[PDB]
RNA sequence: CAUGUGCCAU
């Protein structure tokens, strides 16, 4: 595959082969897509480069559209393109603006195809990270705004381009991605997907006013807050679909677990989880969300949650004597009951705070623990047959000390 | 029932 003027009598490259010989020969494309040839170029381009060698490298690697696209989508050549891009941005000569402008053009024209390509998406992320801000923002504007943007968010490779944008580009230049994701149909498709949920999760974290965003100005905080409220509105409106989904349940858990998103935790608990705890506790994926709600709900909402379990309506009653008995022995609900019991034991033993709003809720935790202990005592025979039941009994048996 | 799900990609 390599041109014969570069091989040995054994079929390998000559030791005294130089970078200028490859650049002057016009056969760089044959080396860059070859295994051992690309690695020669990888070592060569990181040595000392004369003015003309940079001239030749820039032209042949990032100066021709078809050659640039062909190398960016190659299993080996994509590494060479990333190396030359880095050299081009560290070489502040005359054509520093021409080369970066041309590089923008080559990428913008084939933005969707290279995002979806396993190897060219690496060129996108490297360019977003190292290009000047004003140039990197032009690549962001080149992202599609239709159904192709959904395919990017759910692609195994293209989703990292969106994650890179979120990480290194200011929110002002990718706010349209937030409002695209917050569109209900797009949110449904994206949050039902393995890679799409990580994209939405990364967006939520960046839009959170936590310790990592304290460096923002007031204008950047206001912009971030408005984008957060819009996205949270769509998330909370589809909370039932998301909490029960195999992938989106991690997003609802993150929101409920994050103190810096407390307003949306309480919104999720009321609009979605309340009056549905019994049904959701028997769900494979939503039961994890119910555990998080019990762990992190404010004490006023927690009291309503406890009261819903202890004296809750069972519409269309069949099996189980009450909601507590159903959950106590259900294959998934038993983890919720263990969570309820551990919360109450931690509160009674001074391991969990019982004061909120200035008033102590210890008397309520005492009442909930008394109900659970009374139930576990009367059910001890059947609980002894289950792993969960053994742990519930031991939890109450260890609180005696 | 000694029990119940991910992303982390050349």
Vertex A12 angle, CA A8 and A17, to 5°:
75
Name the packing angle between helices A147-154 and A159-168 (round to 10°).
90
Other Cβ atoms within 10 Å of A370 Cβ, number: 12
Per DSSP bridges, beta strands A355-356 and A359-360 are: antiparallel
Who's near A89: CB < 8 A, 6+ residues apart? A96, A100, A130, A131, A132
Strand B closer than 7 Å to the CB of A294?
A: no
Domain containing residue A287: CATH number: 1.25.10.10
Question: Which of A160, A139, A158, A137 has the alpha carbon at shortest distance from A149?
Answer: A158
Measured in whole angstroms, the distance separating CA A232 from the mean position of its chain's CA atoms is 16
Method by which the model was determined: X-ray
Residues 8-67/A with CB < 7 A to strand B: none
d(CA A262, CA A298) in angstroms, rounded, equals 9
Nearest nucleotide to the CA of A253, by C1', is: B5
CB A189 within 8 A of CB A226: no
Q: A95: buried, middle or exposed (CB in 10 Å: 19+, 13-18, 0-12)?
A: middle
**What's the Å distance between residue A155 CA and nucleotide B10 C1'?**
15
Name the packing angle between helices A194-206 and A171-181 (round to 10°).
130
Helix (H, G, I), strand (E, B) or coil at A182: coil
Question: Which of A211, A133, A215, A209 has the alpha carbon at shortest distance from A174?
Answer: A133
**What's the Å distance between residue A203 CA and nucleotide B10 C1'?**
25
CA torsion angle A324 A329 A335 A336 (round to 10): -10
Nearest nucleotide to the CA of A82, by C1', is: B10
**Alpha helix (H) residue ranges in A216-259:** 218-237, 239-243, 249-257
Measured in whole angstroms, the distance separating CA A111 from the mean position of its chain's CA atoms is 22
Resolution for the entry shown, Å: 2.2
Phi-psi sector, A279: left (phi>0), alpha (psi -120 to 50), beta = alpha
d(CA A290, CA A302) in angstroms, rounded, equals 11
Vertex A234 angle, CA A230 and A236, to 5°:
110
| A111, HSE (Cβ side, Cα atoms, 13 Å) | 21
Other Cβ atoms within 10 Å of A139 Cβ, number: 22
Give strand pairing partners of A356. Answer: A359
CB A237 within 8 A of CB A184: yes
User: Domain span at residue A121?
Assistant: 2-401
Residues 145-174/A with CB < 7 A to strand B: 156-157, 159-160
Burial A202-211 (b: 16+ CB within 10 A, else e): bbbbbbbeee
d(CA A385, CA A141) in angstroms, rounded, equals 61
Residues 195-234/A with CB < 7 A to strand B: 195, 197-198, 201
CB A396 within 8 A of CB A346: no
CB A226 within 8 A of CB A172: no
**What's the Å distance between residue A333 CA and nucleotide B4 C1'?**
9
Who's near A237: CB < 8 A, 6+ residues apart? A184
Q: How many domains does chain A have?
A: 1
Q: Residue with CA nearest B9 C1'?
A: A157
Tell me the CA end-to-end span of chain A in Å, nearest whole number. 77
**What's the Å distance between residue A262 CA and nucleotide B1 C1'?**
34
d(CA A195, CA A231) in angstroms, rounded, equals 18
Question: Which of A295, A182, A175, A287 has the alpha carbon at shortest distance from A231?
Answer: A182
d(CA A155, CA A335) in angstroms, rounded, equals 34
Strands (E), A37-131: none
Which H/E stretch holds residue A360?
strand A359-360
Who's near A262: CB < 8 A, 6+ residues apart? A298
Q: A391: buried, middle or exposed (CB in 10 Å: 19+, 13-18, 0-12)?
A: middle
Question: Which of A264, A159, A163 has the alpha carbon at shortest distance from A206?
Answer: A163
Question: Which of A249, A352, A248 has the alpha carbon at shortest distance from A299?
Answer: A352
DSSP-derived secondary structure letter, A100: H
DSSP secondary structure letters along A110-174: THHHHHHSTTHHHHHHHHHHHS-HHHHHHHHHTS-SSHHHHHHHHSTTTHHHHHHHHHHS-HHHH
């Amino acid at each position: 595959v390599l041109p014969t003027w570069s091989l040995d009598s054994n079929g390998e490259m000559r030791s005294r082969l130089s970078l200028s010989e490859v650049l002057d020969s016009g056969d760089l494309m044959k080396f860059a897509v070859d295994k051992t040839g690309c690695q020669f170029l990888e070592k060569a381009v990181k040595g000392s480069l004369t003015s003309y060698q940079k001239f030749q490298l820039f032209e042949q690697v990032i100066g021709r559209k078809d050659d640039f696209l062909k190398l960016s989508t190659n299993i080996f050549g994509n590494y060479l393109v990333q190396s030359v891009i880095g050299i081009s941005l560290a070489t502040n000569d005359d054509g520093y603006t021409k080369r970066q402008e041309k590089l923008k053009n080559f990428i913008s024209s084939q933005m969707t195809d290279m995002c979806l390509d396993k190897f060219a998406c690496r060129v996108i992320q490297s360019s977003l990270q190292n290009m000047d801000l004003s140039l990197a923002c032009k690549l962001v504007q080149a992202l599609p705004r239709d159904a192709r943007l959904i395919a990017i968010c759910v692609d195994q490779n293209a989703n990292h381009v969106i994650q890179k944008v979120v990480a290194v580009i200011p929110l002002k230049n990718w706010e349209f991605i937030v409002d695209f994701v917050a569109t209900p149909e797009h949110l449904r498709q994206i949050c039902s997907d393995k890679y799409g949920c990580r994209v939405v999760q990364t967006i939520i974290e960046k839009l959170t006013a936590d310790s990592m965003n304290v460096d923002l100005t007031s204008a950047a905080q206001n912009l971030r807050e408005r984008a957060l409220q819009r996205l949270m509105t769509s998330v909370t409106n589809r909370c039932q679909e998301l909490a029960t989904n195999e992938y989106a349940n991690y997003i609802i858990q993150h929101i409920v677990s994050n103190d810096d998103l407390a307003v949306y935790r309480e919104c999720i608990i009321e609009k979605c989880l309340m009056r549905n705890l019994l049904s959701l506790s028997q769900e494979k994926f939503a039961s994890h969300v119910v555990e998080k709600a019990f762990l992190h709900a404010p004490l006023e909402l927690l009291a309503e949650m406890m009261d819903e379990i202890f004296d809750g309506y069972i519409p269309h009653p069949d099996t189980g004597k009450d909601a507590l008995d159903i959950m106590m022995f259900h294959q998934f609900g038993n983890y919720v009951v263990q969570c309820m019991l551990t919360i109450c034991c931690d509160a009674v033993s001074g391991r969990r705070q019982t004061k909120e709003g200035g008033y102590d809720h210890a008397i309520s935790f005492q009442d909930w623990l008394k109900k659970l202990h009374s139930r576990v005592t009367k059910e001890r025979h059947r609980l002894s047959r289950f792993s969960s039941g053994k742990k519930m009994i031991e939890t109450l048996a260890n609180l005696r000390s």
